[PDB]
Amino acid sequence: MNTLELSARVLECGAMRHTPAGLPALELLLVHESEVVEAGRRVELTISAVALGDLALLLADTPLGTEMQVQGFLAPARKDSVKVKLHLQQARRIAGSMGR
Amino acid sequence: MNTLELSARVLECGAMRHTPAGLPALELLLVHESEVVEAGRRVELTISAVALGDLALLLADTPLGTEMQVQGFLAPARKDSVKVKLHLQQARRIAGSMGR
Numbered sequence: 001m002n003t004l005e006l007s008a009r010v011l012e013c014g015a016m017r018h019t020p021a022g023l024p025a026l027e028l029l030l031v032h033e034s035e036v037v038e039a040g041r042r043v044e045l046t047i048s049a050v051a052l053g054d055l056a057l058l059l060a061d062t063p064l065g066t067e068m069q070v071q072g073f074l075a076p077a078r079k080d081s082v083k084v085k086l087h088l089q090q091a092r093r094i095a096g097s098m099g100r
Numbered sequence: 101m102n103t104l105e106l107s108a109r110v111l112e113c114g115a116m117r118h119t120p121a122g123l124p125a126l127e128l129l130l131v132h133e134s135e136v137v138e139a140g141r142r143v144e145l146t147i148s149a150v151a152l153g154d155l156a157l158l159l160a161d162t163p164l165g166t167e168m169q170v171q172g173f174l175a176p177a178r179k180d181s182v183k184v185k186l187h188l189q190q191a192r193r194i195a196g197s198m199g200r
């Protein structure tokens with residue numbers, strides 16, 4: 001079991017990159033702000049995220065500030081790192097009807 | 101939305117501590133090892149976890165090596181920290197029938 005579901009806004013969206021094996025790869029910087037319940041609290045969390053393959057292609061050029069629901073697994077950012085990165089398995093924009 | 105579900109083993113279990121407001125607090129160090137789907141692999145993740153209140157009392161003196169399913173929210177360890185901490189909302193040992 002390793003699944004993080006997070007509501008987040010796009011702070012940064014990288015240019016299209018690739019894995020050493022030639023698969024599309026895209027890095028995003030995400031910010032989450034919410035109030036949660038702990039022992040009967042607000043949280044602000046900044047987190048790096050990476051999408052590979054088709055999802056990287058879909059998330060290409062996501063405007064900055066876009067609000068999203070995402071899901072994936074957590075992993076250390078680099079070998080031996082304290083920094084974690086969210087490996088995206090799902091991402092959807094919070095579509096609205098304003099929208100002006 | 102901010103929920104991480106993780107299967108993990110206890111590498112460290114702290115002594116009973118307290119919040120500044122006097123609530124029970126307990127820190128654990130958890131290791132996760134699994135293989136996941138990345139579209140498309142192996143993930144090994146070490147993460148600090150903190151339980152407050154009644155869950156802290158329940159998790160007191162968890163033997164090192166105990167395997168668990170945990171759930172909670174992610175938050176930075178401190179301002180501008182790259183270290184994240186799982187704020188435990190649920191924890192259960194993986195009970196088995198072996199013995200010994």
Ligand code: NA
Pocket residue numbers: 001002134135136
């Ligand atoms: Na897993």
Ligand code: NA
Pocket residue numbers: 019020021
């Ligand atoms: Na790779």
Ligand code: NA
Pocket residue numbers: 034035036101102
């Ligand atoms: Na939330």
